[PDB]
């Protein structure tokens, strides 16, 4: 281990902090997954998970995998090799999903934007209006691009598909959005939505949570992609049998998810969404007070789960990250690929409160001084805390 | 929860009991997987994992998946669709691997044996001697068939491949054997060996541990199967970069594996193998004293990780399992598919000692009476404990 | 630290096995004991603790101490130096309490019996009959002598006090009885009852739980023993203030006690008492099958929380304890003081089930063979199992 | 129980934050305290505890008690009723110790100062000069008064005792100093030093750690105070027997203390003292920037483990504590007794780092605005950060 004094400040956008009640719930020996207790628990998880996607008709699947594995399940259950997909390259994780799509032998129409911009829906509109024969089988879009702090407008994608009477499936990566930003599966007509357990759900890595619409389930009948581990049909077979698991799940993660959902419902999903909004706004006010720039190029794309901070050209963003780890016991997110060295990222998602964030922001001011950037000490902390003092609600449990 | 008094007796062959030191090691918040601590830890895990496979030249991969996902990785990295495989159907898990092989569009030559028998190597010999053009690309064989308690002789498979000068790859499922039975990857010339974390390693579910020979790595160059999540090449890319992880791992499971390996090395792999042998022998002596039958039909196939007990035709093995759970707080393994109702299974693998086993065996005697089978109370416990009293070693830490 | 394979079998009569939900509850950071949460939790603990003493009139105190500290609190709050007490020396822990009584300058009338016998009540009657001037201020009696497996009849003590119309206080050590044997504080007119957390409550050491009748509280007014840390009046002061704690408690033990009481009420106290009666009878049956002798000399004094086993002259009881630790990963109780080397102890209390005990008993058979006693293997297990197969109830949570 | 989002900010001066490796170490079932493992562990604890007291001659005792119980042990082992003691009343905890001294029938010479001042050493000198017949048997002095943030100079007390050639014993409460401020038991000639586990050691409540000089041990021979639970002689008896425990310890706290001492030695005691000096100075700088006043009246008495902050007349200090709990998920210390409503306390001790403190300080700024104090947001954070950016050392484990 590389011990440092006090509690480590985890401000990467995934993995995130795990609440103590959830750590306690996972503190347990293994159990027999074919015992009656594990199906009974699973049944309550499947029902409650629908609530965080805001679906009544969707079917969830709890894969023992990561977000990348959930991606793969969404594609191989609904599509066949050679099928045409439209996807939006706006940063590193949208890029990696497109890399996966190409490697699974789909025909990807790539719509590129500069990093810090959102998906180009004008190009989408143009592609849909020209696609009279309905060759585009799916739209694959990242809701929140974790590399750049850009949130896309999923409802506008649905507006366009309906406008053109176009039957393409809508597959949405909500890995860094679900349970932090608003997500409305049924209202937006999302056919496959996915998230990972180590993001806003505030768990260890290891669940890739997939939720499919009736339309996506219908599509599996014609899907000629190959799948076994990620095949929805095996799960559906075991759902009907009442045992739920075609192979072994993580007992610990199932009890942990139970506790995580209980905390989410106790705080209240809409209160969680408002909490992320306050923390994102607070962070963006601090970045402006420092004189630095948000990577996000227009206010319509702001992300309340991550802020990608751009640094002047003589400052190395990856040196900020290194100094945070070595001196301040603080984990910040690296700039990736195209924005390597030009940004660092402040994650603000999952189970984190305002004083935690303010401690991070104060550390960043010291790091900036350490690398020779002339910040006025306290100016960002003061901008965040002046805003937060107006809006922090009282904790209802304490009256 | 379905609470019962005292400690639950977990005697299914996976998941198994987790030692307390490993539970403690996993009792932790998330950490940044791109921090320097996680690569440094990973490097020591990859080195030590080679020791439990007994390989010096093999390359390990720590997938966040289950044993079924490790299966899929072994096939899709080394083979192409349409390739001819020989595999051995001797029970439920060998059957499920063949189901997977067929579903990934390989041409499977299935060699069937009755449940309770081992792989038919005479048929193998015949297929190899006829295969002058080397159309068989791989042999896929389960080392220990968890459904029936049958262990196959992997060295004999290698003897035959070399005898016929035959270049087929050797893929071995050691899910219920590695770190309990002897496994000699390099001496046996295994090209892909795999295990799961929830078996003898004594962890939660969630790691599918794959170890590949240089020959298997060479084969990825010609593999035209599709893979992304399970693609070895992405791991190898990140191994060379020194960060190791192409996507997020489970932080908790990495520290837990560190603690599990430390305990394995402290007890000593050969002492662990001898401990499983004592417990299996003890169990088989008890079954004979009860007047029941081992499913395993010949002594050459006995399994020191699981004993499948056959019950007379008027006794329902699944009623034994149910009664264990409802009255004795004891988890026993169900008969599966073909042996449903005709067997129940006593798992004896992972971190379990002799008094734990004897408590299970005494419970089974009471259950047998409960269902009207005329056991002589104490006869199986006495047969096991008479044998064990000769062979239990002193605990070295206590002198 | 001195690792052995598998789970350690803890069969000493204190500390006992901690249920896993209680381990989870205690898995937490410190909290501010002056914050509103700790008084609110404490109030519920005080109410529910009364139910395990079976009192409605009594006042409980949760001292951060051990059983010996609860002893000391019991004495110094109700008595003055020079006060005459009657106490019963029947074993090591009744002896230690008398040693403490003498060192606190009380005038102790010691009624002695051989180890393996109960309190001599005909001597008590004679003392009460002769004490016309009520110089006897208290009877101090151990309910269950953990060193010998002897349980005294507290109801019979009250009968004698009432028969002679004698006002003495009745102080009762129930450290190894309460929440395992029946205990009726009000029905028996017990004035001070005490237990410790690491016994049948199944917690860590660290709470000395004292419960006082209104008569005992009146006695504090005239008690001139010196006390501060153990003074009930400081607790009562803070009870009235609403904050409950005159100095810092263990946060972890308070939450642990909440969880332990919840498990007790879920199983049901009467069911817990029944479960201890099964375990005790099964152990005594095994001892009889082995041809060994119970230390306890009459049936009326049998203890359902501990069995002290007498060994023949060529056997050293300490060697049995040593062998259990070194070979079998089993903890058994030593013979103490007068019975050192002549006995060993099997503890059967707190959260333990029948298959755990049977594993212990099977292990003891092997140890007896090791040290040269001609036991018939299986004979004690068979006697215990025959009995238990008729009496173990179904687990109500599992239907 | 009263859940709030994110991690709770624990800034009371006891209980303090527990490091995660210590939480993990304590996450364990009970064990037999008479088994060979617990004496072997205890011996290492006794040796290493001496290093935190900076003694080679002293004998430590690990009582299962709180700080108040360590007080009581200190007094009753070295003094007799009627013995004259000199003690210094400067705050709530020095007052409680005097209250205990009087209730144990000692003749207490009370030297009083205003809250916010240190011990009046010129009065002590005058007392020592006048005590020709050495009737003063001991000086009892709190090293750090946790109620006011005042640290006394123990070296100056020893200087006066030696100047007047006076033999009195020197008993020192270091409950909120040891392992945070410097403490030199032998160099200062301290005869009894005591601390509690839930302070800078960063454990749960439940150990009262007492360390006695050879002179204090000689004093037990003539001490006629009554004691059993707290009697050092019973410990010394069991030290010589090799088993160390006269009654049952907390297993979890022993392993927890092992892990806590390991963390202390890894960071380095001198580095821990430096870290507390940084935290204290940063807090006092923030207080000065806010325009508030330190309760401590002279620089020589400043405390690096707690800062008591005085608020203006229109502000109720208790309202600040309440608001911190209800809105900000922050625990701060109440003003006690004489300074109730006039002060609040910021605890800065044990395992806490600079970004944790800065989060607290930023939160206090918001609370001051809430309750109507015209703070300049960022002003205290900026003062603390400017100072800390020059002094935080690099974490040696991370290079
Ligand atoms: C939006 C998004 N999708 C997918 C991924 C990949 O998820 P994982 O690392 O769990 O495979 C990430 C990275 O965490 C992400 O941020
Ligand atoms: C030999 C064998 N291989 C593979 C599997 C499948 O493993 P998992 O359930 O982790 O997917 C099992 C079942 O546990 C097994 O026993
Ligand atoms: C009946 C009885 N009373 C008192 C004690 C002393 O308890 P402790 O070891 O908690 O101080 C014991 C020992 O556990 C005991 O068995
Ligand atoms: C200096 C000092 N001494 C003694 C005590 C009493 O300690 P406890 O609450 O552990 O009994 C305290 C309070 O924590 C204290 O601060």
Author numbering:
A (entry chain A), B (entry chain A), C (entry chain B), D (entry chain B): 3 to 401
From the paper:
The tertiary structure of Arabidopsis AGT1 is characteristic of the subgroup IV class of PLP-containing enzymes. The reaction mechanism of human AGT1 has been described in detail, and because the catalytic residues are conserved in Arabidopsis AGT1, this protein likely has the same mechanism.
The results described herein are for the AGT1 crystals grown in the presence of l-serine and are valid for both structures unless explicitly mentioned. In the AGT1 structure crystallized in the presence of l-serine, a pyridoxamine phosphate (PMP) molecule and no internal aldimine bond were expected, but the geometry and close distance of the PMP amino group (N4A) to the Lys201 NZ suggested that the cofactor should best be modeled as PLP. l-Serine molecule (magenta) was modeled in AGT1 guided by the difference density in (A). The l-serine hydroxyl group is within hydrogen-bonding distance of Tyr35′, Arg36′, and a water molecule. Indeed, these two residues are highly conserved among a wide range of known and putative plant serine:glyoxylate amino transferases. Data for both crystals were collected at room temperature.
